[PDB]
Design a protein around this ligand. Structure first.
Ligand SMILES: [Zn+2]
Lengths: 127, 76
């Protein structure tokens, strides 16, 4: 999986990890922390993960679990290909059966950069 | 009447409610049992997120209905 450093951009580092990218942060205050709503915007462009808590259910078709544990985000590799369907999968409450399928396309670095730059008012950027 | 709330770990919570209870009140009942602040709770029924000022009856949530509890999360 991926366990980021504990700096304020930790959740953005997870979103980048799941899309084959890295980020640089100029400082990310707690009001600008990555939350589930921002993570969902990234999910919509590459629906490969469930956001949850430790012990929480992961969509059987998720490639990753992005886990928020006491205000720290990390990523665990899951057992699916990354073929999630919609917000129910994102939240881990879907009725999916594990399916085979082509590996998922990551969000492009430039597209992810624009989302992160806007969400953090310029403070977090994709490398 | 009783309703059920399924949590992300698969735990089921049983709540004592009335049809006129507001979603806000239901969230406070969930806090009583699970310790999750209401502002972090997202309640889902019939695929829809329930809004705080509405009542259970507004969503036709009847006895022995099951809701899903998902969470706002931030962090780292
Ligand atoms: Zn699913």
């Amino acid at each position: 999986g991926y366990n980021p450093p504990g700096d304020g951009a930790c959740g953005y580092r997870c979103l980048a990890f799941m899309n084959g990218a890295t980020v640089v942060s100029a400082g990310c205050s707690s009001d600008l922390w990555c939350d589930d709503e921002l993570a969902y915007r990234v999910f919509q462009l590459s629906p490969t993960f469930t956001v949850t808590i430790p012990g929480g259910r992961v969509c059987p078709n998720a490639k990753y679990a992005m886990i928020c544990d006491k205000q720290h985000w990390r990523v665990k590799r899951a057992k699916g290909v990354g073929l999630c369907l919609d917000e129910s999968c994102f939240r881990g409450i879907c009725n999916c059966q594990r399916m085979s399928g082509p590996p998922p396309a990551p969000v492009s670095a430039a597209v992810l950069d624009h989302i992160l730059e806007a969400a953090t008012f310029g403070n977090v950027r994709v490398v | 009447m009783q309703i059920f709330v399924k949590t992300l770990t698969g735990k089921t919570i049983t709540l004592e409610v009335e049809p006129s209870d507001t979603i806000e009140n239901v969230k406070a009942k969930i806090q009583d049992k699970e310790g999750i602040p209401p502002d972090q709770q997202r309640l889902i029924f019939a695929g829809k997120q329930l809004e705080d000022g509405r009542t259970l009856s507004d969503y036709n949530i009847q006895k022995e209905s099951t809701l899903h509890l998902v969470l706002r999360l931030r962090g780292x």
